[PDB]
């Protein structure tokens, strides 16, 4: 069963999550929208391809259909918007960490090093909870990002790490407690650049993992949930690779077509 220390741990995790994760994205507004050579590889924005939907509080609906790669500059049409969403999410994640005792007790320099290391991963973890695997769309309140699984794209073309990651993780049908424990394990990674107290962070991480493992063996006895803990841990390892791949993808785009916000520049060292 779960000890008092583990139960207390999950509770502060859950508490921090409900206080800082605006599941309906109610407070996300004033964001930009798409206007009404090295560039070769810089064609990474083609792995995205998502239509956007904005449901007005009055019953109205705005829908955006992205352009097709042609000529050159037009695939950058969705970057400003996506930058505004990323920043909004990042703020939620920063608030998440600062409200966690185990994180506050760490030295200020290490908090920064941990956040710059895990910010992306925690966002993805949060995005997975509003992801609908049936329709292939991230439901963010009045806003929706539906995958272009439709004129040419194929539902089996999950060769994109990001997407495959979301489908697989969603397939595990985790509980809220499991998702927050995953965020704790990712945030408290001793192997992040610039970390000082690598020993503290490492013990903390091990404790979060042990709590997740115990939480699993105490609340999921069905054969379907066997090796669940190991599958989750394997997912986090995948999320780490993807994270590095995305950072590099981001830096290349940022090098030719600046779009990162101040908060994004801080996190990526720009």
Curated annotation (Swiss-Prot):
Coiled coil: none annotated. Residues 5-270 form the NR LBD domain. GO terms for cellular component: chromatin; intermediate filament cytoskeleton; nuclear body; nucleoplasm; nucleus; transcription regulator complex. It is found in: Nucleus. Keywords: Activator, DNA-binding, Metal-binding, Nucleus, Receptor, Transcription, Transcription regulation, Zinc, Zinc-finger. The keyword Nucleus applies. Expressed in liver, colon and small intestine. Its main location: nucleus. Hyperforin binds at residues 86, 124-127, 246. One of its GO terms (biological process) is cellular response to molecule of bacterial origin. It comes from the Eukaryota. GO terms for molecular function: DNA-binding transcription activator activity, RNA polymerase II-specific; DNA-binding transcription factor activity, RNA polymerase II-specific; nuclear receptor activity; nuclear receptor binding; RNA polymerase II cis-regulatory region sequence-specific DNA binding; RNA polymerase II transcription regulatory region sequence-specific DNA binding; sequence-specific double-stranded DNA binding; zinc ion binding. Heterodimer with RXR. Interacts with NCOA1. Interacts (via domain NR LBD) with CRY1 and CRY2 in a ligand-dependent manner. Nuclear receptor that binds and is activated by variety of endogenous and xenobiotic compounds. Transcription factor that activates the transcription of multiple genes involved in the metabolism and secretion of potentially harmful xenobiotics, drugs and endogenous compounds. Activated by the antibiotic rifampicin and various plant metabolites, such as hyperforin, guggulipid, colupulone, and isoflavones. Response to specific ligands is species-specific. Activated by naturally occurring steroids, such as pregnenolone and progesterone. Belongs to the nuclear hormone receptor family. NR1 subfamily. This is Nuclear receptor subfamily 1 group I member 2. It comes from Homo sapiens (Human). The lineage of its organism: Eukaryota, Metazoa, Chordata, Craniata, Vertebrata. The chain holds residues 142 to 431 of 434 of the full protein.
């Amino acid at each position: 069963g779960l000890t008092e220390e583990q139960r207390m741990m999950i509770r502060e995790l859950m508490d921090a999550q409900m206080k800082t994760f605006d599941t309906t994205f109610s407070h996300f507004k004033n964001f930009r929208l798409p206007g009404v050579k090295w560039s070769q590889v810089r064609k990474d924005l083609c792995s995205l391809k998502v239509s956007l939907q904005l449901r007005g509080e009055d019953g109205s609906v705005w829908n955006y259909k992205p352009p097709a790669d042609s000529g050159g500059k037009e695939i950058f049409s969705l970057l400003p918007h996506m930058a505004d969403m990323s920043t909004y999410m990042f703020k939620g994640i920063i608030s998440f960490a600062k409200v966690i005792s185990y994180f506050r007790d760490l030295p200020i320099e290490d908090q920064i090093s941990l956040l710059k290391g895990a910010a992306f991963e925690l966002c993805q973890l949060r995005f997975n909870t509003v992801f609908n695997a049936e329709t292939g769309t991230w439901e963010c309140g009045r806003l929706s990002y539906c995958l272009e699984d439709t004129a040419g794209g194929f539902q089996q073309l999950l060769l994109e790490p990001m997407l495959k990651f979301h489908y697989m993780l969603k397939k595990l049908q985790l509980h809220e407690e499991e998702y927050v424990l995953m965020q704790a394990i990712s945030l408290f990674s001793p192997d992040r650049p610039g970390v000082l107290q690598h020993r503290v962070v490492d013990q903390l991480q091990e404790q979060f993992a042990i709590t997740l493992k115990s939480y699993i063996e105490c609340n999921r006895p069905q054969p379907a949930h066997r090796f669940l803990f190991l599958k989750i841990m394997a997912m986090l390892t995948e999320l780490r690779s993807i994270n590095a791949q995305h950072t590099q993808r981001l830096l290349r785009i940022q090098d030719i077509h600046p779009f990162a916000t101040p908060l994004m520049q801080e996190l990526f060292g720009i």
